[PDB]
């Protein structure tokens, strides 16, 4: 998919993307340090090769504009890439 393709562009891996979860802008801002201009969808995929969760943040439908990618490791440390 579009969203799996973005994850693969950014990680080099083909992963199963979970059904989206909606986050309000202030919710997202606490996590990321930037406040999105509207609601965010979190599309999560587990990267078993590294035991990492990969979270693709887009705007809501129908645009699904990519906004950020969060990769969390098993120690619970986040890396963020703004898209």
Short mmCIF file of C-alpha atoms in Angstrom, two decimals:
data_model
loop_
_atom_site.label_atom_id
_atom_site.label_comp_id
_atom_site.label_asym_id
_atom_site.label_seq_id
_atom_site.Cartn_x
_atom_site.Cartn_y
_atom_site.Cartn_z
CA UNK A 1 0.00 0.00 0.00
CA UNK A 2 0.78 3.73 -0.15
CA UNK A 3 1.40 3.73 3.57
CA UNK A 4 3.41 0.48 3.52
CA UNK A 5 5.40 1.94 0.63
CA UNK A 6 6.24 5.00 2.68
CA UNK A 7 7.40 2.83 5.56
CA UNK A 8 9.45 0.79 3.16
CA UNK A 9 10.93 3.90 1.57
CA UNK A 10 11.98 5.10 4.98
CA UNK A 11 13.03 1.78 6.58
CA UNK A 12 13.82 -0.55 3.67
CA UNK A 13 11.42 -3.12 5.08
CA UNK A 14 8.06 -4.59 4.07
CA UNK A 15 5.95 -4.65 7.22
CA UNK A 16 2.38 -5.40 8.19
CA UNK A 17 0.57 -2.11 8.84
CA UNK A 18 -1.99 -2.13 11.69
CA UNK A 19 -5.39 -0.42 11.47
CA UNK A 20 -5.12 3.30 12.18
CA UNK A 21 -5.54 4.97 15.56
CA UNK A 22 -6.54 8.66 15.75
CA UNK A 23 -4.70 11.16 17.95
CA UNK A 24 -5.72 14.78 18.68
CA UNK A 25 -3.15 17.54 17.89
CA UNK A 26 -2.30 18.14 21.58
CA UNK A 27 -1.83 14.43 22.15
CA UNK A 28 0.59 14.31 19.26
CA UNK A 29 2.38 17.47 20.40
CA UNK A 30 3.22 15.91 23.78
CA UNK A 31 4.86 12.98 21.98
CA UNK A 32 6.59 14.82 19.09
CA UNK A 33 7.31 18.39 20.20
CA UNK A 34 5.43 19.84 17.24
CA UNK A 35 1.69 20.31 17.09
CA UNK A 36 0.01 19.07 13.89
CA UNK A 37 -2.48 21.39 12.20
CA UNK A 38 -5.26 18.77 12.49
CA UNK A 39 -5.91 15.20 13.71
CA UNK A 40 -3.26 12.55 13.12
CA UNK A 41 -3.60 8.90 12.18
CA UNK A 42 -1.02 6.50 13.66
CA UNK A 43 -0.29 3.50 11.45
CA UNK A 44 1.86 1.09 13.42
CA UNK A 45 4.02 -1.75 12.14
CA UNK A 46 6.18 -4.14 14.11
CA UNK A 47 9.72 -4.67 12.74
CA UNK A 48 10.59 -8.06 14.12
CA UNK A 49 14.03 -7.92 12.49
CA UNK A 50 15.06 -5.23 15.00
CA UNK A 51 12.29 -5.63 17.61
CA UNK A 52 11.23 -2.07 16.78
CA UNK A 53 7.80 -0.50 16.49
CA UNK A 54 7.50 1.80 13.50
CA UNK A 55 4.76 4.39 13.70
CA UNK A 56 3.80 6.35 10.60
CA UNK A 57 1.87 9.53 11.42
CA UNK A 58 -0.39 10.93 8.65
CA UNK A 59 -3.27 13.39 8.59
CA UNK A 60 -6.74 11.91 8.46
CA UNK A 61 -8.54 10.73 5.38
CA UNK A 62 -8.94 11.38 2.64
CA UNK A 63 -5.56 13.11 2.30
CA UNK A 64 -3.41 10.87 4.57
CA UNK A 65 -0.57 13.38 4.31
CA UNK A 66 2.61 11.91 5.81
CA UNK A 67 3.76 14.01 8.75
CA UNK A 68 6.21 12.07 10.85
CA UNK A 69 7.77 8.64 11.40
CA UNK A 70 8.45 7.39 14.93
CA UNK A 71 10.61 4.33 15.53
CA UNK A 72 10.65 2.97 19.07
CA UNK A 73 13.15 0.38 20.27
CA UNK A 74 12.68 -2.34 22.90
CA UNK A 75 14.20 -0.09 25.57
CA UNK A 76 11.36 2.32 24.75
CA UNK A 77 13.51 5.01 23.14
CA UNK A 78 11.95 7.03 20.32
CA UNK A 79 13.62 8.31 17.14
CA UNK A 80 11.53 10.81 15.15
CA UNK A 81 11.77 11.79 11.52
CA UNK A 82 9.54 14.58 10.31
CA UNK A 83 8.21 13.75 6.82
#
